[PDB]
Amino acid sequence: MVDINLFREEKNNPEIIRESQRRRFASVEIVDEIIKLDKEWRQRQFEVDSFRKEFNKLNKQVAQLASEIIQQTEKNKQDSTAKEAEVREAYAALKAKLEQVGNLVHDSVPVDKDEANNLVIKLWGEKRFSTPGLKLKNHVDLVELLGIADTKRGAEIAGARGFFLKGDGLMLNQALINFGLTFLKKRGFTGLQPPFFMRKDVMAKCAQLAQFDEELYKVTGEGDDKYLIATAEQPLSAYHIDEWIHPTELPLRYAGYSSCFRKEAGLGIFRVHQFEKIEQFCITGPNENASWEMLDEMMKNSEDFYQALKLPYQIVSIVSGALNDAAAKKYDLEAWFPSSETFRELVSCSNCTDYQARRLEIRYQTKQYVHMLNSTLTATERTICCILENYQREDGVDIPEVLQPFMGGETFLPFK
Amino acid sequence: MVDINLFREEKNNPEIIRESQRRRFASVEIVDEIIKLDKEWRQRQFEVDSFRKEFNKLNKQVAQLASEIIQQTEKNKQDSTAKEAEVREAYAALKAKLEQVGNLVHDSVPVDKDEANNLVIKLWGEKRFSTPGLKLKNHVDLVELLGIADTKRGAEIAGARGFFLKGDGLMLNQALINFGLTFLKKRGFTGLQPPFFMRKDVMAKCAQLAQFDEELYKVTGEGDDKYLIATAEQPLSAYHIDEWIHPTELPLRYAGYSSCFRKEAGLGIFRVHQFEKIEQFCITGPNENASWEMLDEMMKNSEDFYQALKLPYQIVSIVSGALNDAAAKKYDLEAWFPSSETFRELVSCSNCTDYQARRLEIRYQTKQYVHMLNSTLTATERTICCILENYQREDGVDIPEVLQPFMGGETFLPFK
């Protein structure tokens, strides 16, 4: 939820919310609905203090003086707990409209309703193509040829889009997780591996609202009903819930690692239900444009990493209309897939400012909340598919150089 | 299920099954029940061939010759599909008793009803104790002091016995998985990472019967209802289901790796719902005592590994009475926990011979099935708890030597 204070011309200026609503191609009226609703809530919270205030003007000098105004102090003491309710059903009606307002869209964000108008802002890398000596194979056919996944036996076991990693497939995955974690460790990041369970209660306060809520796997189990996490970002957001964080602790840098479960996948390993993910999770103070410097820091770390792997890519800024509710601004790094000659998304990078922080009561007198950003570094299975296509030869695949140490210095996976 | 042929004095000797039943402290009568039930099944399968045989003795020479025996060939052709049913409800009654017979208990197995009488057969390692200079801490208090798990924030997120790994905790876990996988790779093992999902249909044919069936997490999800795997052994067993395997492919050696989910756990990380596991999975021919040599091979690999980590241990042979239904014979490697001065189980090692193979129709003329063995190498979280206790000092923990390369050559985790 956004800050009710960004709606009050008493403390202004609500037109900023109105602009954000326009850019999100969503209700501008709801900004008037909510102002009226706040008006009521703070009236009733004062129509309480009307009774509270009269209350010690009635019990002013009952003993220190006879009088029958103590039949009225029965009406008042009682009245104080009548308005006591009104406040509670005002605030709740206010919260039901407020919950629907997306985060304030940053002015740098391209305004448009369609991802088709999504804006490329940076290129890097020399893109391979099929020549007539080398017809470039797709990840699907390179996996089979290489013998490093069993999607057939995987599908009969876990159902559709289910895979085993096998032999040098498993080493590669593990190779990439450790390259990932050390890469981030060197840049001041602290590992966190969350549980792949989250209580629906907590999840309710997390993710990106009604869009990422009733579309996870359910786990029946032991205590409360639980979800399988879709993204390490979710649990990591819940770390530091209801906590205070001290200016001196910030910034915080968690290299998140977990297995990931998504219901909406659609035999390869790009389009899957289960997969592993390293993520950059970062908390900042809310002032001094600290979260905006941190977005650049994370985006640079994602670029540096895809450069280390020598994977050609392009960076796209996402249109205001495509931003989800938490995100104030967002980049994709889309990486080159030679066989099909398309860019595909391997990284998403978001500044969500205080939007989740305010829900998870993650505090920084008059209520300041911290800024939180999240940036996939590598979905390993996808990243591998990208690596197989870009490093293929006539009779196998060359291992990226940075990943050769974590594979015992092997440099080539031969076709079977 | 055991081989119905091990019950037939026609092909003998059923007393061997009777002995196994005694050693398992279970019904000996059921061996007579089942002989009678097989008798019926093969009678009715012949009371079919009674009709089938008469059938071409009636349709002997109908054309090649008048006669009204073709009113009888109506009774017969029909009768052939009456007994056709009897066979199908005989075999099914036979299967309902047969399903309850545990695997043939190996003669080397100590006969007894109580794990209390579980037989120590080998020691290794010099066990540390609390001296009055060094009071030895437990894994629970070493984790907190070291700052490498958050069981508090973990518990509020995933519910009870839920943990984050953190900083050098995560490196250690990853360190141990890779030490594990390379260790086994050098000994002729091939990585397999299964899916953490299995369709209940398949799981039904897997695990150790009614004891390991209605006690997994349930996953609601997309297609059929699924379980979270309790052990990498389960999926790996389903690999090669309904397949033939060629003498020349055997032996097979899968180093299984997965995350693992158990409902029955009971703040530390020893007694947990989610954890990771490397396992030795091995398939052999059924002859030439090949599975029995393979059990020794795997047991030696488990010993070598706990020696590499310099963890003192003892090997126990499990009493006939404690063997589950799949297991013909079983060892535990129980490792030394100094603070509490107890041995705790870090490895289980089973020869299940053809028991699952016969259910999963995993074939090797007259029906031969392969032998399958399974042996945990490391439950990482437990293995770490063991490592923290045995390598502690006054102001932190020394990293095992073999694990120092996979931690960038760090040799000490300092207390906070």
Side-chain angles (χ1 to χ4, degrees), chain A residues 109-133 135-136:
Chain A
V109 173
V111 187
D112 211 288
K113 203 192 185 140
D114 206 303
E115 281 214 303
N117 307 300
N118 229 44
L119 203 85
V120 166
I121 69 167
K122 205 177 167 183
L123 310 176
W124 179 97
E126 283 287 328
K127 305 178 276 288
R128 290 185 63 195
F129 290 86
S130 277
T131 65
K135 174 61 154 184
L136 288 190

mmCIF file of all heavy atoms in Angstrom, chain A residues 109-136, unseen atoms left out:
data_model
loop_
_atom_site.group_PDB
_atom_site.id
_atom_site.type_symbol
_atom_site.label_atom_id
_atom_site.label_comp_id
_atom_site.label_asym_id
_atom_site.label_seq_id
_atom_site.Cartn_x
_atom_site.Cartn_y
_atom_site.Cartn_z
ATOM 1 N N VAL A 109 10.093 6.628 -16.233
ATOM 2 C CA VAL A 109 9.496 5.378 -16.768
ATOM 3 C C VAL A 109 8.751 5.709 -18.056
ATOM 4 O O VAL A 109 7.857 6.562 -18.072
ATOM 5 C CB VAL A 109 8.587 4.711 -15.719
ATOM 6 C CG1 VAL A 109 7.823 3.529 -16.298
ATOM 7 C CG2 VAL A 109 9.376 4.271 -14.498
ATOM 8 N N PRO A 110 9.041 4.995 -19.167
ATOM 9 C CA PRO A 110 8.322 5.207 -20.417
ATOM 10 C C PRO A 110 6.822 4.981 -20.209
ATOM 11 O O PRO A 110 6.459 3.879 -19.840
ATOM 12 C CB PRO A 110 8.842 4.157 -21.393
ATOM 13 C CG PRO A 110 10.056 3.561 -20.728
ATOM 14 C CD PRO A 110 10.030 3.925 -19.261
ATOM 15 N N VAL A 111 6.004 5.999 -20.500
ATOM 16 C CA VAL A 111 4.524 5.962 -20.339
ATOM 17 C C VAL A 111 3.878 5.354 -21.588
ATOM 18 O O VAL A 111 4.062 5.888 -22.669
ATOM 19 C CB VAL A 111 3.962 7.357 -20.050
ATOM 20 C CG1 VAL A 111 2.486 7.265 -19.724
ATOM 21 C CG2 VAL A 111 4.719 8.041 -18.925
ATOM 22 N N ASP A 112 3.115 4.279 -21.410
ATOM 23 C CA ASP A 112 2.515 3.469 -22.494
ATOM 24 C C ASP A 112 1.787 2.281 -21.862
ATOM 25 O O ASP A 112 2.147 1.899 -20.722
ATOM 26 C CB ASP A 112 3.593 3.001 -23.456
ATOM 27 C CG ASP A 112 3.072 2.851 -24.856
ATOM 28 O OD1 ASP A 112 2.297 1.868 -25.093
ATOM 29 O OD2 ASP A 112 3.424 3.733 -25.683
ATOM 30 N N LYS A 113 0.802 1.714 -22.559
ATOM 31 C CA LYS A 113 -0.029 0.607 -22.025
ATOM 32 C C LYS A 113 0.542 -0.742 -22.480
ATOM 33 O O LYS A 113 0.204 -1.760 -21.863
ATOM 34 C CB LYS A 113 -1.488 0.754 -22.461
ATOM 35 C CG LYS A 113 -2.478 0.028 -21.561
ATOM 36 C CD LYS A 113 -3.880 -0.071 -22.118
ATOM 37 C CE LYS A 113 -4.859 -0.704 -21.145
ATOM 38 N NZ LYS A 113 -6.164 -0.005 -21.178
ATOM 39 N N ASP A 114 1.386 -0.776 -23.503
ATOM 40 C CA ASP A 114 1.759 -2.064 -24.133
ATOM 41 C C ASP A 114 3.268 -2.301 -24.005
ATOM 42 O O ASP A 114 4.049 -1.473 -24.489
ATOM 43 C CB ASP A 114 1.256 -2.077 -25.576
ATOM 44 C CG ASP A 114 0.988 -3.467 -26.126
ATOM 45 O OD1 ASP A 114 1.935 -4.280 -26.120
ATOM 46 O OD2 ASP A 114 -0.165 -3.723 -26.551
ATOM 47 N N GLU A 115 3.656 -3.432 -23.413
ATOM 48 C CA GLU A 115 5.038 -3.998 -23.467
ATOM 49 C C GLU A 115 5.574 -4.026 -24.917
ATOM 50 O O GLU A 115 6.793 -4.109 -25.117
ATOM 51 C CB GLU A 115 5.039 -5.398 -22.838
ATOM 52 C CG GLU A 115 5.058 -5.391 -21.315
ATOM 53 C CD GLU A 115 5.822 -6.538 -20.664
ATOM 54 O OE1 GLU A 115 5.465 -7.703 -20.954
ATOM 55 O OE2 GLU A 115 6.772 -6.266 -19.868
ATOM 56 N N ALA A 116 4.712 -3.995 -25.934
ATOM 57 C CA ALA A 116 5.164 -3.934 -27.343
ATOM 58 C C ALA A 116 6.013 -2.670 -27.536
ATOM 59 O O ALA A 116 6.919 -2.704 -28.382
ATOM 60 C CB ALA A 116 3.980 -3.975 -28.271
ATOM 61 N N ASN A 117 5.732 -1.612 -26.758
ATOM 62 C CA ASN A 117 6.355 -0.262 -26.840
ATOM 63 C C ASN A 117 7.467 -0.181 -25.793
ATOM 64 O O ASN A 117 7.976 0.917 -25.508
ATOM 65 C CB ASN A 117 5.346 0.865 -26.585
ATOM 66 C CG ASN A 117 4.109 0.801 -27.457
ATOM 67 O OD1 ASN A 117 4.231 0.851 -28.680
ATOM 68 N ND2 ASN A 117 2.929 0.698 -26.845
ATOM 69 N N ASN A 118 7.762 -1.317 -25.184
ATOM 70 C CA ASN A 118 8.899 -1.535 -24.253
ATOM 71 C C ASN A 118 10.196 -1.032 -24.926
ATOM 72 O O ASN A 118 10.440 -1.382 -26.111
ATOM 73 C CB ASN A 118 8.904 -3.021 -23.892
ATOM 74 C CG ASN A 118 9.003 -3.325 -22.423
ATOM 75 O OD1 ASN A 118 8.341 -2.698 -21.599
ATOM 76 N ND2 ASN A 118 9.771 -4.353 -22.115
ATOM 77 N N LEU A 119 11.011 -0.258 -24.197
ATOM 78 C CA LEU A 119 12.062 0.657 -24.732
ATOM 79 C C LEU A 119 13.466 0.066 -24.532
ATOM 80 O O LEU A 119 13.928 0.086 -23.390
ATOM 81 C CB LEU A 119 11.918 1.957 -23.935
ATOM 82 C CG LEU A 119 12.450 3.236 -24.577
ATOM 83 C CD1 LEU A 119 11.398 3.845 -25.507
ATOM 84 C CD2 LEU A 119 12.873 4.243 -23.503
ATOM 85 N N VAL A 120 14.143 -0.424 -25.579
ATOM 86 C CA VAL A 120 15.550 -0.926 -25.487
ATOM 87 C C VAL A 120 16.482 0.249 -25.169
ATOM 88 O O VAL A 120 16.332 1.316 -25.772
ATOM 89 C CB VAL A 120 15.990 -1.648 -26.773
ATOM 90 C CG1 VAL A 120 17.495 -1.852 -26.807
ATOM 91 C CG2 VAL A 120 15.279 -2.980 -26.940
ATOM 92 N N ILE A 121 17.400 0.098 -24.224
ATOM 93 C CA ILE A 121 18.231 1.259 -23.785
ATOM 94 C C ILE A 121 19.723 0.913 -23.822
ATOM 95 O O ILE A 121 20.520 1.868 -23.652
ATOM 96 C CB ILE A 121 17.798 1.790 -22.401
ATOM 97 C CG1 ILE A 121 18.103 0.823 -21.265
ATOM 98 C CG2 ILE A 121 16.332 2.183 -22.393
ATOM 99 C CD1 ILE A 121 17.961 1.470 -19.922
ATOM 100 N N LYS A 122 20.086 -0.362 -24.040
ATOM 101 C CA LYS A 122 21.504 -0.816 -24.041
ATOM 102 C C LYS A 122 21.661 -2.198 -24.690
ATOM 103 O O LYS A 122 20.868 -3.083 -24.412
ATOM 104 C CB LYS A 122 22.090 -0.840 -22.625
ATOM 105 C CG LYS A 122 23.603 -0.708 -22.634
ATOM 106 C CD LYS A 122 24.266 -0.646 -21.284
ATOM 107 C CE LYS A 122 25.765 -0.833 -21.427
ATOM 108 N NZ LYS A 122 26.461 -0.849 -20.119
ATOM 109 N N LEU A 123 22.700 -2.357 -25.507
ATOM 110 C CA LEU A 123 23.099 -3.624 -26.167
ATOM 111 C C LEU A 123 24.471 -4.040 -25.636
ATOM 112 O O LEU A 123 25.192 -3.186 -25.101
ATOM 113 C CB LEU A 123 23.145 -3.400 -27.680
ATOM 114 C CG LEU A 123 21.902 -2.747 -28.286
ATOM 115 C CD1 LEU A 123 22.093 -2.482 -29.768
ATOM 116 C CD2 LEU A 123 20.668 -3.608 -28.059
ATOM 117 N N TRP A 124 24.805 -5.322 -25.726
ATOM 118 C CA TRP A 124 26.183 -5.804 -25.454
ATOM 119 C C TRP A 124 26.353 -7.200 -26.060
ATOM 120 O O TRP A 124 25.411 -8.011 -25.934
ATOM 121 C CB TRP A 124 26.513 -5.770 -23.953
ATOM 122 C CG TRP A 124 27.896 -6.279 -23.684
ATOM 123 C CD1 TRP A 124 29.021 -5.528 -23.525
ATOM 124 C CD2 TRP A 124 28.317 -7.659 -23.607
ATOM 125 N NE1 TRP A 124 30.102 -6.341 -23.322
ATOM 126 C CE2 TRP A 124 29.706 -7.651 -23.384
ATOM 127 C CE3 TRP A 124 27.662 -8.896 -23.699
ATOM 128 C CZ2 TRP A 124 30.442 -8.823 -23.255
ATOM 129 C CZ3 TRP A 124 28.394 -10.058 -23.575
ATOM 130 C CH2 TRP A 124 29.766 -10.017 -23.353
ATOM 131 N N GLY A 125 27.500 -7.462 -26.697
ATOM 132 C CA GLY A 125 27.883 -8.821 -27.123
ATOM 133 C C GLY A 125 27.736 -9.027 -28.619
ATOM 134 O O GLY A 125 26.896 -8.358 -29.226
ATOM 135 N N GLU A 126 28.538 -9.933 -29.180
ATOM 136 C CA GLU A 126 28.550 -10.264 -30.622
ATOM 137 C C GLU A 126 27.721 -11.528 -30.830
ATOM 138 O O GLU A 126 28.150 -12.595 -30.391
ATOM 139 C CB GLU A 126 29.996 -10.348 -31.108
ATOM 140 C CG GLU A 126 30.602 -8.963 -31.311
ATOM 141 C CD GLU A 126 30.098 -8.189 -32.533
ATOM 142 O OE1 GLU A 126 29.759 -8.842 -33.566
ATOM 143 O OE2 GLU A 126 30.059 -6.926 -32.463
ATOM 144 N N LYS A 127 26.566 -11.382 -31.472
ATOM 145 C CA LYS A 127 25.531 -12.438 -31.592
ATOM 146 C C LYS A 127 25.904 -13.428 -32.703
ATOM 147 O O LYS A 127 26.081 -13.004 -33.862
ATOM 148 C CB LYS A 127 24.164 -11.818 -31.896
ATOM 149 C CG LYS A 127 23.687 -10.753 -30.916
ATOM 150 C CD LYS A 127 22.337 -10.142 -31.290
ATOM 151 C CE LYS A 127 22.415 -9.002 -32.291
ATOM 152 N NZ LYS A 127 22.992 -7.778 -31.688
ATOM 153 N N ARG A 128 25.985 -14.710 -32.354
ATOM 154 C CA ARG A 128 26.158 -15.830 -33.310
ATOM 155 C C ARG A 128 24.880 -15.992 -34.133
ATOM 156 O O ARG A 128 23.808 -15.648 -33.622
ATOM 157 C CB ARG A 128 26.457 -17.141 -32.575
ATOM 158 C CG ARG A 128 27.830 -17.179 -31.921
ATOM 159 C CD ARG A 128 28.128 -18.537 -31.320
ATOM 160 N NE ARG A 128 28.165 -19.579 -32.332
ATOM 161 C CZ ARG A 128 28.122 -20.887 -32.094
ATOM 162 N NH1 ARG A 128 28.024 -21.362 -30.863
ATOM 163 N NH2 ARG A 128 28.169 -21.724 -33.112
ATOM 164 N N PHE A 129 25.018 -16.533 -35.347
ATOM 165 C CA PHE A 129 23.913 -16.923 -36.257
ATOM 166 C C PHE A 129 24.250 -18.269 -36.879
ATOM 167 O O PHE A 129 25.445 -18.583 -36.940
ATOM 168 C CB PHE A 129 23.739 -15.872 -37.351
ATOM 169 C CG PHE A 129 23.190 -14.565 -36.848
ATOM 170 C CD1 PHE A 129 24.030 -13.592 -36.328
ATOM 171 C CD2 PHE A 129 21.827 -14.334 -36.862
ATOM 172 C CE1 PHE A 129 23.514 -12.395 -35.849
ATOM 173 C CE2 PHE A 129 21.310 -13.138 -36.388
ATOM 174 C CZ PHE A 129 22.154 -12.163 -35.890
ATOM 175 N N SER A 130 23.239 -19.019 -37.312
ATOM 176 C CA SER A 130 23.415 -20.161 -38.242
ATOM 177 C C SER A 130 24.123 -19.657 -39.496
ATOM 178 O O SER A 130 23.626 -18.701 -40.123
ATOM 179 C CB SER A 130 22.119 -20.825 -38.591
ATOM 180 O OG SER A 130 21.747 -21.756 -37.592
ATOM 181 N N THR A 131 25.288 -20.230 -39.782
ATOM 182 C CA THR A 131 25.961 -20.199 -41.100
ATOM 183 C C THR A 131 25.560 -21.499 -41.789
ATOM 184 O O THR A 131 24.833 -22.296 -41.199
ATOM 185 C CB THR A 131 27.468 -19.992 -40.902
ATOM 186 O OG1 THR A 131 27.938 -21.156 -40.228
ATOM 187 C CG2 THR A 131 27.800 -18.748 -40.107
ATOM 188 N N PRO A 132 25.992 -21.760 -43.043
ATOM 189 C CA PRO A 132 25.579 -22.968 -43.756
ATOM 190 C C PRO A 132 26.522 -24.152 -43.493
ATOM 191 O O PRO A 132 26.188 -25.253 -43.902
ATOM 192 C CB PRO A 132 25.606 -22.542 -45.229
ATOM 193 C CG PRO A 132 26.503 -21.293 -45.282
ATOM 194 C CD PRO A 132 26.874 -20.913 -43.861
ATOM 195 N N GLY A 133 27.659 -23.885 -42.841
ATOM 196 C CA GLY A 133 28.510 -24.894 -42.190
ATOM 197 C C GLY A 133 27.932 -25.352 -40.856
ATOM 198 O O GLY A 133 28.008 -26.564 -40.582
ATOM 199 N N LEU A 134 27.386 -24.428 -40.052
ATOM 200 C CA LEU A 134 26.819 -24.706 -38.701
ATOM 201 C C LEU A 134 25.385 -24.170 -38.608
ATOM 202 O O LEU A 134 25.209 -22.976 -38.323
ATOM 203 C CB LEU A 134 27.702 -24.070 -37.620
ATOM 204 N N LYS A 135 24.408 -25.043 -38.847
ATOM 205 C CA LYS A 135 22.987 -24.851 -38.463
ATOM 206 C C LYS A 135 22.895 -24.882 -36.934
ATOM 207 O O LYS A 135 23.185 -25.941 -36.350
ATOM 208 C CB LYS A 135 22.141 -25.967 -39.084
ATOM 209 C CG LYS A 135 20.682 -25.996 -38.656
ATOM 210 C CD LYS A 135 19.931 -24.744 -39.023
ATOM 211 C CE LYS A 135 18.449 -24.999 -39.186
ATOM 212 N NZ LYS A 135 17.735 -23.787 -39.647
ATOM 213 N N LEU A 136 22.503 -23.772 -36.307
ATOM 214 C CA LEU A 136 22.473 -23.648 -34.827
ATOM 215 C C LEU A 136 21.239 -24.348 -34.253
ATOM 216 O O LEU A 136 20.105 -23.904 -34.546
ATOM 217 C CB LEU A 136 22.499 -22.171 -34.437
ATOM 218 C CG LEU A 136 23.840 -21.487 -34.660
ATOM 219 C CD1 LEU A 136 23.849 -20.109 -34.028
ATOM 220 C CD2 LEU A 136 24.983 -22.320 -34.112
#
